[PDB]
Amino acid sequence: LPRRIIKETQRLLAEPVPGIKAEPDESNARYFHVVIAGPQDSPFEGGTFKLELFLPEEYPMAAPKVRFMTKIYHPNVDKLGRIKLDILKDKWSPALQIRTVLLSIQALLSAPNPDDPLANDVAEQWKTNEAQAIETARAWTRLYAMN
C-alpha cells in the first residue's frame, strides 16, 4: 500500500476515534468494518451502527467509499445505507483523511440535514413532523441497532 494508507490504517488501530471502532477486513487491506456509536443526545444514542469503508485504487485522489450496513432512519441515509454527504462526492480533497469522514458521518447522525436536495423521503417526515421522525429514528434504533 501507499505510505498514506499504511499511515491511516495504523493510526486507526493506535489512535481510535471516540465512539467509533474501525477494523481492517481479514482479506482486503483497503476494506474496513466500522462501528459507529449513536451520538449522545441523538435519537440513535445507545445504538451501534455498522458501516463499511473502502479505499479505492485512486485514493486519496478518489474519495473513500462508505455505506451503512445497519438499517437506520435518517434523512441522509437511504434504504440501502448509502450516505448523502458532500465530502464523499462534491467537497472531497486528499487532505481530508478517513477519520474526518467518519467523524462527519457521526456528526450527520448528531445533526440530520432534512433539507438536502437528494434526501430520502424520510426527509419529508423530518421536515413536517420532526417530533414523529425523531421518535421513529429512536424506534428503528431499538429495532435494528441494539444488537
Partner: protein, 71 residues
C-alpha cells in the same frame, strides 16, 4: 487563556482567547494560522457546531478546551 484547535490534518494549534470572544473572532485567529476563511470553517465542541454570533462563554469552553475544525 489558551485553547487548542485540532486542525484538518489532526495537528493541534494553540489560540490566545478570552471567554468574551465571539466564534467569528476565534475563526479569524484560525484563518491567520491555517489560511482557511471563516465561512469555510465549522468548529465543533462536545459533538456540536459553534454558531458565529455566540461567545466561548456561551458554550462553556474554558481554559485548555479543545475545539475541532472540519470543513
Amino acid at each position: 487563556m489558551q485553547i487548542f484547535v485540532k486542525t484538518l490534518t489532526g495537528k493541534t494549534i494553540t489560540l490566545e482567547v478570552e471567554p468574551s470572544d465571539t466564534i467569528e473572532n476565534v475563526k479569524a485567529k484560525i484563518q491567520d494560522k491555517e489560511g482557511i476563511p471563516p465561512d469555510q470553517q465549522r468548529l465543533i465542541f462536545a459533538g456540536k457546531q459553534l454558531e458565529d454570533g455566540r461567545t466561548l462563554s456561551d458554550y462553556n469552553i474554558q481554559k485548555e478546551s479543545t475545539l475541532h475544525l472540519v470543513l
